[PDB]
Amino acid sequence: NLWVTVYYGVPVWKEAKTTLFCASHNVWATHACVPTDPNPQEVVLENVTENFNMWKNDMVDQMQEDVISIWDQSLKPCVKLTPLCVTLNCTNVTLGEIKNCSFDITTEIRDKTRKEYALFYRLDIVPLSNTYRLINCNTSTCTQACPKVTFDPIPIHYCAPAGYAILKCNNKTFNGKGPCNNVSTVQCTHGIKPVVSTQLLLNGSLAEEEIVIRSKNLADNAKIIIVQLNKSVEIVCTRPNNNTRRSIRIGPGQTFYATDIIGDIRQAYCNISGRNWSEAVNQVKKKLKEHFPHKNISFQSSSGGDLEITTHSFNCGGEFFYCNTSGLFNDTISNATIMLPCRIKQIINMWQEVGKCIYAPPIKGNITCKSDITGLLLLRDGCNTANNAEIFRPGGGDMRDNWRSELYKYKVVKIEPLGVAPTRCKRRFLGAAGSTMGAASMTLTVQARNLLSGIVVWGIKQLQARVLAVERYLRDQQLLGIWGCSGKLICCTNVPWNSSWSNRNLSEIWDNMTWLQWDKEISNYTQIIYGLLEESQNQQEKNEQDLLAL
Amino acid sequence: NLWVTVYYGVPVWKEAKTTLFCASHNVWATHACVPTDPNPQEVVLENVTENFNMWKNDMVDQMQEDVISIWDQSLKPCVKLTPLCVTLNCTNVTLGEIKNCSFDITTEIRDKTRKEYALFYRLDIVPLSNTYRLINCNTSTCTQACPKVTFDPIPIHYCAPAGYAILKCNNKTFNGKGPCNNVSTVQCTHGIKPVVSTQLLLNGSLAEEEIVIRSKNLADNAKIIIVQLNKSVEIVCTRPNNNTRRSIRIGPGQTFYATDIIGDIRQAYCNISGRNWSEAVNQVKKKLKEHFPHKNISFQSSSGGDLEITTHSFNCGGEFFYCNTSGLFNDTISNATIMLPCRIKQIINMWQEVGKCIYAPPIKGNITCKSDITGLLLLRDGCNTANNAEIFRPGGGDMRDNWRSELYKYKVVKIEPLGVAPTRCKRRFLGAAGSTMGAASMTLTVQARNLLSGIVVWGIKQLQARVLAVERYLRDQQLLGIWGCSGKLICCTNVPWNSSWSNRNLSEIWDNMTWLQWDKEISNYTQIIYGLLEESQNQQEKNEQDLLAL
Amino acid sequence: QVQLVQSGAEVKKPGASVKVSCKASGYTFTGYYMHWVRQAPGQGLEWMGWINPNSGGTNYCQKFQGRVTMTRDTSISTAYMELSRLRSDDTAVYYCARGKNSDYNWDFQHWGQGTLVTV
Amino acid sequence: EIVLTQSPATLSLSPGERATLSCRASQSVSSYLAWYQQKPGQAPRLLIYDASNRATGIPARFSGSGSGTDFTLTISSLEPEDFAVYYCQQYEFFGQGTKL
Ligand SMILES: *[C@@H]1O[C@H](CO)[C@@H](O[C@@H]2O[C@H](CO)[C@@H](O[C@@H]3O[C@H](CO[C@H]4O[C@H](CO)[C@@H](O)[C@H](O[C@H]5O[C@H](CO)[C@@H](O)[C@H](O)[C@@H]5O)[C@@H]4O)[C@@H](O)[C@H](O[C@H]4O[C@H](CO)[C@@H](O)[C@H](O)[C@@H]4O[C@H]4O[C@H](CO)[C@@H](O)[C@H](O)[C@@H]4O)[C@@H]3O)[C@H](O)[C@H]2NC(C)=O)[C@H](O)[C@H]1NC(C)=O
Ligand SMILES: *[C@@H]1O[C@H](CO)[C@@H](O[C@@H]2O[C@H](CO)[C@@H](O[C@@H]3O[C@H](CO[C@H]4O[C@H](CO)[C@@H](O)[C@H](O[C@H]5O[C@H](CO)[C@@H](O)[C@H](O)[C@@H]5O)[C@@H]4O)[C@@H](O)[C@H](O[C@H]4O[C@H](CO)[C@@H](O)[C@H](O)[C@@H]4O[C@H]4O[C@H](CO)[C@@H](O)[C@H](O)[C@@H]4O)[C@@H]3O)[C@H](O)[C@H]2NC(C)=O)[C@H](O)[C@H]1NC(C)=O
Ligand SMILES: *[C@@H]1O[C@H](CO)[C@@H](O[C@@H]2O[C@H](CO)[C@@H](O[C@@H]3O[C@H](CO[C@H]4O[C@H](CO)[C@@H](O)[C@H](O[C@H]5O[C@H](CO)[C@@H](O)[C@H](O)[C@@H]5O)[C@@H]4O)[C@@H](O)[C@H](O[C@H]4O[C@H](CO)[C@@H](O)[C@H](O)[C@@H]4O)[C@@H]3O)[C@H](O)[C@H]2NC(C)=O)[C@H](O)[C@H]1NC(C)=O
Ligand SMILES: *[C@@H]1O[C@H](CO)[C@@H](O[C@@H]2O[C@H](CO)[C@@H](O[C@@H]3O[C@H](CO[C@H]4O[C@H](CO)[C@@H](O)[C@H](O[C@H]5O[C@H](CO)[C@@H](O)[C@H](O)[C@@H]5O)[C@@H]4O)[C@@H](O)[C@H](O[C@H]4O[C@H](CO)[C@@H](O)[C@H](O)[C@@H]4O)[C@@H]3O)[C@H](O)[C@H]2NC(C)=O)[C@H](O)[C@H]1NC(C)=O
Ligand SMILES: *[C@@H]1O[C@H](CO)[C@@H](O[C@@H]2O[C@H](CO)[C@@H](O[C@@H]3O[C@H](CO)[C@@H](O)[C@H](O)[C@@H]3O)[C@H](O)[C@H]2NC(C)=O)[C@H](O)[C@H]1NC(C)=O
Ligand SMILES: *[C@@H]1O[C@H](CO)[C@@H](O[C@@H]2O[C@H](CO)[C@@H](O[C@@H]3O[C@H](CO)[C@@H](O)[C@H](O)[C@@H]3O)[C@H](O)[C@H]2NC(C)=O)[C@H](O)[C@H]1NC(C)=O
Ligand SMILES: *[C@@H]1O[C@H](CO)[C@@H](O[C@@H]2O[C@H](CO)[C@@H](O)[C@H](O)[C@H]2NC(C)=O)[C@H](O)[C@H]1NC(C)=O
Ligand SMILES: *[C@@H]1O[C@H](CO)[C@@H](O[C@@H]2O[C@H](CO)[C@@H](O)[C@H](O)[C@H]2NC(C)=O)[C@H](O)[C@H]1NC(C)=O
Ligand SMILES: *[C@@H]1O[C@H](CO)[C@@H](O[C@@H]2O[C@H](CO)[C@@H](O)[C@H](O)[C@H]2NC(C)=O)[C@H](O)[C@H]1NC(C)=O
Ligand SMILES: *[C@@H]1O[C@H](CO)[C@@H](O[C@@H]2O[C@H](CO)[C@@H](O)[C@H](O)[C@H]2NC(C)=O)[C@H](O)[C@H]1NC(C)=O
Ligand SMILES: *[C@@H]1O[C@H](CO)[C@@H](O[C@@H]2O[C@H](CO)[C@@H](O)[C@H](O)[C@H]2NC(C)=O)[C@H](O)[C@H]1NC(C)=O
Ligand SMILES: *[C@@H]1O[C@H](CO)[C@@H](O)[C@H](O)[C@H]1NC(C)=O
Ligand SMILES: *[C@@H]1O[C@H](CO)[C@@H](O)[C@H](O)[C@H]1NC(C)=O
Ligand SMILES: *[C@@H]1O[C@H](CO)[C@@H](O)[C@H](O)[C@H]1NC(C)=O
Ligand SMILES: *[C@@H]1O[C@H](CO)[C@@H](O)[C@H](O)[C@H]1NC(C)=O
Ligand SMILES: *[C@@H]1O[C@H](CO)[C@@H](O)[C@H](O)[C@H]1NC(C)=O
Ligand SMILES: *[C@@H]1O[C@H](CO)[C@@H](O)[C@H](O)[C@H]1NC(C)=O
Ligand SMILES: *[C@@H]1O[C@H](CO)[C@@H](O)[C@H](O)[C@H]1NC(C)=O
Ligand SMILES: *[C@@H]1O[C@H](CO)[C@@H](O)[C@H](O)[C@H]1NC(C)=O
């Protein structure tokens, strides 16, 4: 008859919530990250169909926390602009977006003060009949970004700790929700750029097959629709001004950087080819129509909200600014290049954190950024018109949706190497997932050997991960030891197989079924078997002592 | 003859000094604590008599540090009342305990100031002929408790890390010092409330059998006597006033909360039934008499000291206040409910930490607290009177004695699973503690399996604990491996038993003695045996190589 | 090293009150209890009481209850004792003392010079 | 209460000799005793504590022992410098002491 046999290193897994670590004086690519692995091993799991859900992927929330945590830490040692909150006597420089302001500054010696001046943008100034104050003075103290930092969105690779694995959905037309017949396993993600933006997603990944439109629920007009493009659209933005910096000493080793202007003033703007955009829009509308088969499609401007939403926000590698994209989110489009006007802020409120504020220093000389539009965020108007037309608008604001637009292909699971199966006996990477239980047993070492030390503000995470990996490893080894199966990969025991545990044919089990399928059926009695196994060894130990005593 | 045999998983332990972890935006029940275990396993260790000493229990000191560490961290991000230290021009509101004070406040703009007013209690004000200052301005800067915190004494459960165990003394009449014939083992303590109080201990645990009076040494009049009651006494305290709060902006995102009054003013007080108290007092005096068999007993008021000692201090879930309990610590008691007057402080000095200070915000509306007196702290007057009467007074101040009054039933020990015994052979939870060496060997797995991962400002402690558990585990496993006893629970060796190690009968050893008793006798040669065992394996290894070479 | 420095001798009239200071140095003032004991002029020593600087808590010998009081000022590491309703029999040298260990604090290892008070 | 009695009240001794001083109590106090040396015009000085341990700066020749209710101080190789008053103490309770 059949007996219990223990297998260690079987290719099965379950959804898990763990912590991933960062693989590369940048603001994001900090010194605490590890070197990347230049050769990812995309092992194809043929005959394995995993189900993914980008809308419940904890990786996104983890990413969000990571980005913020780093940001805050990076600006920790930077100058706090406390003494800046003084009476501002301002005049003019019709592009009157810049005001020349004078104020009283406290010198190195507390007993002494003097006059000083700086150029500020109207957007950063609040009327207090020509006296003003800095906008932040009634909310919090803005921290001046340290003069020697880099805000370039250097791509970050996420890697799993030993015992865990990252699955990829390689189905180029996957909607981000459902089965992925085309699935592979990797140790790390690719390099994803921490691009902070709204409306139009820049410097992201392009679709590999076609334009894909995905959402949590198209029937829910309170949710955002994410569209990923296959063909990129070039957009170039520039700030054609002599923003000469000035160094103002506001304390004992604390320098404030003020803006100055040498020449004249021209508004910043973006340049996007009309013909290009038009084509892209037409293509997107077509795909939308497929979901909304008997209606017209119209693109309009933002319904309203904070500047950060109504306009296109992005970091041009320098000073942050916002552009008016009403010329793009439209139905009437010209072939000629479209110029979009923009405005610049010195005082920036990151994300949606109240009380958080940073001040950006001026960059001497002009700036020009060449970037690609890779996708965008749209929302649909509620209700329905007799005109049988649906209206879509730009939106965003929650950076999690930006991260979600890149990490949607990844899923994190934990490997459960210990399995039990019925056999006819009595005692005395992960590619095998697609193989049958029998054949899969020939790769137990290949898998098991990589469940311990595969790894060889981020510091604490790496340390925690290391400990966890050890705990799990030892736990399993302890069990194998107790059951008298130490050092074995396939261990036949002295416990008989139950009839209530399975009614499957032995041949089907080993020749047809895979370990994943088996687990889902036999797991019902996991603890039952373990208990019996422990009792068996106890019996054996006393029997050995009995014999030894002779 | 007899030979050395190694046993792994034997039920023995020794006193140890380790770190316990917390099991549950509360000030104490922080996010860093783990979920509790709803089903403690009080395993009774029959025939085991452990000795406890509440006066040397490190758990108490650990608790003290925990409470403070959390407190400090919790108030870290809260507003520092620096700018408050200005000239105070005060007038009257005979209950003249509240003064209306005006002062100069610096506005959001550093260049601008204005007039402002607030109500303060006399106790928080120091004369500087009607000009005052805040009491703390010459000591430290008080931190205003964040407006969104909770000071409710949510009970905390202490749990041991793997390899350690917590013993309980279940003897209802245990004095807190000596043998506990009634002893059990648990994984975690019960939920103990972090109640900060003096004199009368509120919301604590009640005696299960009778009123118990315990002390380190009754002959030492410099020590505190702790009495635990079986029958609780209800006490209700209230602050019947319209303490309407006002929000004053004292900086860039910094709001100070001032007190205001809408109606009239009435002193706070506590209500305690006279008859109830009288009965409790009589009972306590009786028990004291047992220790002091030929003398009278008198209860008097505090001899003097800081307000925190002379009066009854406690947190009413809101604003801290102190009550005059001279009406309770007396020999003349009325049946009628006794009203005890109290005074309220806004500025509180926590514990006895100099330089530490917090400011409590006003609570809009009145407050009433219903609580039970569960025990109290008394001290005895030194010397002796010809009147043959002893006088006891209220006291306290060192919170450690409050914690000590709850944790006195617990003891922390470490398990030493490795044991050695003489047998007639040659090679080639914790309930067993009450069992003989022979029988106890049948539960080695039950114990051993829980000495690795039984666990599955607090963060670092949990991480440290995890590592320690691993270190100990591996150490022992390494030894078993070296001695050629890997994977075994009972391993017969090739080393003969010495005559100098023991003169006990083999039968007595296995049939009568327990592992605890054995350890205390055989430990004398622990290292001696280990050395020999290592040499044995070395001999075996070279012998195997010799044979293999053939 | 450590030391206790007491005020100089004092003479009061019967019925009056006397205040005696004791400055401590060389150690944490709040580390230990301060004890007061008086040496009778040709007889054994009589313990008065002690104070705990951490909270100002006190314990007086019963026979002096209502006559003697004690306090402290941590800012200057100085203890104070006061005796009211002075009598001729109160003539003695009042000593300022500290114990060796925080556990058993009756081991008066450290003493001041003593302050002679009479009527 | 505790009442401590010592004897002999006075001892006329010579240099080089050895002598001991008794101390009794009506109640058992285990070993929580102390002995103090007292010289004219001088502050009290701790000599022995725990009825076994020498105080700092105290020569080995100064010792003592006892248990429960019967204790004794022992001083060997007596010197002229030992001609002082010695007190027995338990908690706040002081004895009468003896003079050498
Ligand atoms: C989507 O992705 C695209 C790219 O894929 C992003 O566009 C990129 O954005 C970055 C960041 O702004 C651009 O790099 C920056 O370019 C500045 C212009 O350089 C030119 O003029 C200077 C003037 O003398 C020349 O020297 C330069 O020539 C040198 O660099 C080129 C680069 O390939 C070489 O080929 C040449 O051989 C030369 O080596 C160019 O002609 C440039 O000034 C700036 O450099 C500063 O910042 C970098 C940050 O990494 C520092 O390493 C560097 O040392 C400089 O910083 C120092 O000097 C400043 C001066 O005051 C100090 O303030 C600093 O503290 C520090 O001392 C940087 O190189 C990049 O060119 C651009 N690429 C394209 C194609 O647009 C998009 O922005 C991105 N989208 C979004 C939204 O981010
Ligand atoms: C020994 O133990 C005993 C208990 O075993 C302790 O006594 C307890 O102490 C706590 C803390 O003070 C008491 O809870 C507090 O009670 C306040 C009074 O509530 C009543 O009036 C309000 C007015 O509208 C009603 O709404 C309430 O009804 C609701 O609550 C009762 C409770 O059972 C329910 O049964 C009802 O169905 C209602 O749900 C009552 O009639 C109460 O206001 C206060 O609530 C604030 O604080 C809690 C803290 O955990 C917050 O969760 C809560 O949201 C409130 O805080 C918000 O609002 C305030 C208002 O300004 C803001 O400032 C805050 O920032 C926040 O926004 C709380 O519930 C408890 O009742 C009391 N029990 C007894 C029997 O006395 C002893 O104190 C303890 N001894 C010592 C020394 O601690
Ligand atoms: C900290 O400091 C910040 C400073 O910005 C405070 O935020 C400001 O709070 C005040 C308080 O109400 C806000 O005033 C209200 O503003 C709304 C809208 O006006 C703004 O947004 C419009 C967008 O559609 C924009 O067009 C406006 O610009 C025009 O008007 C200004 C005004 O002079 C003019 O200068 C411009 O050139 C433009 O002409 C402007 O940006 C306004 O509708 C409110 O008035 C309504 O409500 C009042 C209340 O009863 C009523 O009496 C009025 O008749 C009317 O119904 C009101 O003016 C101010 O807008 C906030 N700032 C911003 C940028 O929004 C913040 O509150 C401070 N913190 C704290 C804790 O105080
Ligand atoms: C930081 O700021 C704090 C402010 O509190 C400082 O602490 C204060 O230090 C001074 C310095 O000595 C203390 O003054 C002494 O106070 C004692 C006792 O008085 C207090 O306690 C009494 C309790 O029994 C209480 O009754 C008193 O209240 C009465 O008297 C006040 C005084 O006007 C009156 O307003 C009340 O209505 C009551 O009538 C009071 O609370 C006092 O005895 C001292 O005087 C003696 O010593 C001097 C010194 O030679 C001598 O000249 C006198 O004749 C007398 O012998 C003295 O007044 C003050 O009490 C401390 N505050 C508190 C609350 O105790 C702290 O020191 C500052 N830090 C630093 C580093 O400076
Ligand atoms: C990006 O994805 C979009 C998805 O819609 C692609 O749109 C494709 O556009 C072509 C032409 O407008 C559509 O018609 C095709 O024309 C060729 C002409 O020879 C014909 O052979 C095809 O059978 C088809 O008729 C095509 O249907 C349309 N795609 C879909 C799914 O409808 C767009 O071309 C993609 N761009 C890139 C660069 O991949
Ligand atoms: C809490 O503990 C105290 C401990 O003293 C208990 O006191 C007990 O009080 C009763 C009555 O005052 C004492 O006398 C008993 O009376 C009953 C009456 O039927 C009698 O049967 C008993 O034999 C006894 O005489 C009792 O001796 C006393 N306890 C002791 C140890 O002396 C108090 O009752 C306890 N309260 C509760 C609620 O448990
Ligand atoms: C990628 O996933 C999509 C679905 O997310 C698959 O689309 C299926 O296409 C077939 C073609 O006829 C349809 O019958 C199915 O109903 C589609 N699925 C859904 C959910 O609509 C697509 O085939 C997948 N591509 C690959 C290569 O696996
Ligand atoms: C958005 O589209 C509308 C039309 O769909 C644009 O309105 C046209 O603007 C041009 C010049 O700006 C006029 O000559 C046309 O007559 C307008 N159309 C109508 C029907 O009046 C509108 O300008 C577009 N918005 C942007 C920013 O380009
Ligand atoms: C995925 O399923 C296919 C279809 O059954 C497997 O291909 C068979 O593999 C067995 C293995 O010896 C061959 O005997 C069959 O002839 C194969 N059939 C075909 C149509 O090729 C494939 O091996 C499965 N994948 C894995 C990893 O086992
Ligand atoms: C403490 O107890 C004493 C008596 O033991 C109380 O003194 C009595 O107080 C009442 C009224 O307050 C007087 O009528 C009695 O005559 C007093 N007794 C004596 C002997 O004079 C004292 O009041 C009690 N303290 C408190 C706060 O109640
Ligand atoms: C605690 O001691 C009692 C008394 O010896 C033990 O009870 C004995 O257990 C043996 C075990 O087989 C029995 O044969 C005896 O008859 C029992 N005696 C009595 C009076 O019951 C008890 O087992 C001990 N506890 C443990 C855990 O062994
Ligand atoms: C969609 O737009 C086309 C454009 O000509 C129009 O003919 C068609 O009727 C519209 N659909 C609906 C439902 O109106
Ligand atoms: C570009 O010009 C062609 C000319 O026929 C026209 O059909 C097309 O719609 C124009 N596109 C835009 C975006 O103006
Ligand atoms: C195991 O075998 C026994 C044999 O009678 C049977 O009763 C039981 O239901 C089987 N299954 C389990 C889970 O025990
Ligand atoms: C046993 O299998 C059934 C199958 O649906 C499942 O619902 C049930 O929860 C399983 N029981 C256990 C203990 O796994
Ligand atoms: C104790 O108090 C009672 C009360 O009447 C009294 O009779 C008894 O004598 C007192 N005990 C002593 C020793 O005085
Ligand atoms: C309560 O009244 C009774 C009446 O006989 C009296 O004996 C008792 O002592 C009184 N108790 C108090 C506390 O007043
Ligand atoms: C062990 O046996 C030897 C044998 O002669 C003996 O000398 C020795 O004292 C015994 N004990 C120890 C601790 O070695
Ligand atoms: C040997 O046993 C005696 C028994 O009292 C003990 O004092 C001594 O310290 C022990 N030696 C060792 C090395 O354990």
Short mmCIF file of C-alpha atoms and ligand atoms in Angstrom, two decimals, chain A residues 300 324-333, ligand 8:
data_model
loop_
_atom_site.label_atom_id
_atom_site.label_comp_id
_atom_site.label_asym_id
_atom_site.label_seq_id
_atom_site.Cartn_x
_atom_site.Cartn_y
_atom_site.Cartn_z
CA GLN A 300 -11.36 67.94 -22.48
CA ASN A 324 -1.03 74.33 -19.29
CA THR A 325 -2.02 71.36 -21.43
CA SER A 326 -5.45 72.55 -22.54
CA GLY A 327 -3.97 72.59 -26.05
CA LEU A 328 -3.45 68.83 -25.96
CA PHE A 329 -6.49 67.54 -24.17
CA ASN A 330 -8.73 68.72 -26.96
CA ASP A 331 -10.62 67.51 -30.01
CA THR A 332 -9.33 70.26 -32.30
CA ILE A 333 -5.67 69.68 -33.05
C1 LIG E 8 -9.93 73.37 -27.86
O1 LIG E 8 -10.75 73.01 -29.00
C2 LIG E 8 -11.64 74.07 -29.38
C3 LIG E 8 -12.47 73.56 -30.54
O2 LIG E 8 -12.90 72.21 -30.45
C4 LIG E 8 -10.82 75.30 -29.77
O3 LIG E 8 -11.69 76.38 -30.17
C5 LIG E 8 -11.24 76.91 -31.40
O4 LIG E 8 -10.14 77.84 -31.21
C6 LIG E 8 -9.69 78.43 -32.45
C7 LIG E 8 -8.57 79.38 -32.09
O5 LIG E 8 -8.10 79.28 -30.76
C8 LIG E 8 -10.86 79.17 -33.08
O6 LIG E 8 -10.47 79.75 -34.32
C9 LIG E 8 -12.01 78.20 -33.35
O7 LIG E 8 -13.15 78.86 -33.96
C10 LIG E 8 -12.42 77.64 -32.04
N1 LIG E 8 -13.52 76.71 -32.23
C11 LIG E 8 -14.76 77.07 -31.99
C12 LIG E 8 -15.83 76.04 -32.22
O8 LIG E 8 -15.03 78.21 -31.61
C13 LIG E 8 -10.00 75.73 -28.56
O9 LIG E 8 -9.20 76.89 -28.88
C14 LIG E 8 -9.11 74.61 -28.21
N2 LIG E 8 -8.30 74.98 -27.07
C15 LIG E 8 -7.02 75.19 -27.20
C16 LIG E 8 -6.26 75.58 -25.97
O10 LIG E 8 -6.46 75.07 -28.30
#
